[PDB]
């Protein structure tokens, strides 16, 4: 019934293309298209890991109590902004052992909703109500890179990189839940297969993107640097 333009750029046109690609369109159906899209995006971001949904940010360690941000889903490289240094993640028992038994390497763990560090780190960041003030990040400022949970659509004008990069993915993953809402199985299976194929293509692209500029050959690393 409804019309739509060639590019599905925004939520407003996606919620109409959904009803178009499925003639099952009416009052009792269009009102829940938002819920189907919500379920589809949740099913997507639950396991999708790609750059465009990443986010880098400084942390405040406070030697221990340091807390995990709300948007934490998976941690990428973690380091500082001074001469470079990469942390490695270990288990709580290793850190508890390090505490008593005893600074080039630095470890960390995940205690519930915290990030513990064996050394008494003193990373500094501006407080909450600070107005602007980039602060010219001081030293001992760790920078964390992780995968952040993207926002949920709340306005027809609201767009997202997924719409501009792969709208068919959302359209199929939401037609799945649509054909589930109504009684239909063939469409469910076909849309699920197509969405899974698109997601596989995207993750394979991400894979072929990483470490894709030259071959590798470990040069028999046996710690040439031992003197220190």
């Amino acid at each position: 019934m409804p019309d739509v333009q060639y590019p599905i750029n925004t939520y407003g046109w996606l919620k109409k293309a959904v009803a178009l690609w499925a003639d099952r369109d009416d009052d009792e159906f269009v009102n829940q298209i938002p819920n189907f899209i919500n379920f589809a995006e949740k099913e997507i971001y639950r396991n999708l890991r790609i750059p465009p949904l990443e986010k880098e940010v400084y942390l405040d360690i406070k030697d221990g109590v340091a807390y995990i941000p709300p948007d934490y889903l998976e941690a990428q490289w973690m380091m500082r902004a001074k001469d470079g240094t990469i942390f490695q993640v270990t288990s709580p028992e290793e850190i508890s052992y390090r505490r008593q038994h005893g600074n080039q390497p630095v470890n960390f763990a995940r205690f519930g909703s915290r990030f513990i560090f064996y050394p008494s780190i003193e990373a500094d960041t501006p407080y909450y109500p600070d107005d602007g003030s980039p602060l010219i990040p001081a030293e001992n400022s760790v920078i964390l890179s992780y995968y952040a949970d993207p926002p949920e659509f709340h306005e027809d004008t609201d767009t997202s990189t997924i719409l501009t990069i792969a709208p068919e993915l959302l359209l199929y993953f939401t037609l799945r839940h649509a054909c589930l809402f109504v009684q239909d199985d063939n469409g469910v299976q076909k849309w699920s297969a197509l969405g899974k194929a698109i997601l596989d293509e995207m993750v394979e692209q991400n894979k072929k993107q990483e470490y894709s500029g030259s071959p590798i050959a470990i040069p028999n690393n046996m710690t040439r640097l031992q003197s220190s």
Partner: peptide, 8 residues
């Protein structure tokens, strides 16, 4: 010197 995680 470490405490528990209370509710919001």
């Amino acid at each position: 010197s470490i405490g528990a995680y209370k509710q919001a």
